[PDB]
């Protein structure tokens, strides 16, 4: 039972692509085929269009509770 926005917001996409781009750097393994760029932000943003980023988000409701949404299932704009 999870009732929040099904849409990924902008800040969600910023932190997911930031950490995922740092989850590419320091020899970290990549899960899509690449045309050969060296900027990790392009790599992490191509996995967002791939829906291959496995990250689960703990959206803190103000009680202290949270829902576990998945970037695989969140609808980008």
């Amino acid at each position: 039972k999870r009732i929040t926005t099904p849409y990924m917001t902008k800040y969600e996409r910023a932190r997911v692509l930031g950490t995922r781009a740092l989850q590419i750097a320091m020899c970290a393994p990549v899960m899509v085929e690449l045309e050969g760029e060296t900027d990790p932000l392009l790599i992490a943003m191509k996995e967002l269009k791939a829906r291959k980023i496995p990250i689960i988000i703990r959206r803190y409701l103000p009680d202290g509770s949270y829902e576990d949404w998945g970037v695989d299932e969140l609808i980008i704009t």
Binding site: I3, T4, T5, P6
Partner: protein
């Protein structure tokens, strides 16, 4: 005492107090519902010819 149903017990609540707008589709404000419906009435008139 059917007057308790003739006089409704209240008006219904706004559509974005009950049935919140982030999940529940087509729950907009009353002002925006009035604007959408006036433009539907005008759009049918201009799209008639």
């Amino acid at each position: 005492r059917r007057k308790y149903q003739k006089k409704a017990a209240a008006c219904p609540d706004p559509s974005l107090s009950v049935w919140r707008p982030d999940i529940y589709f087509a729950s907009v404000s009353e002002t925006f519902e009035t604007k959408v419906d006036d433009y539907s009435q005008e759009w049918a008139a201009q799209t008639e010819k």
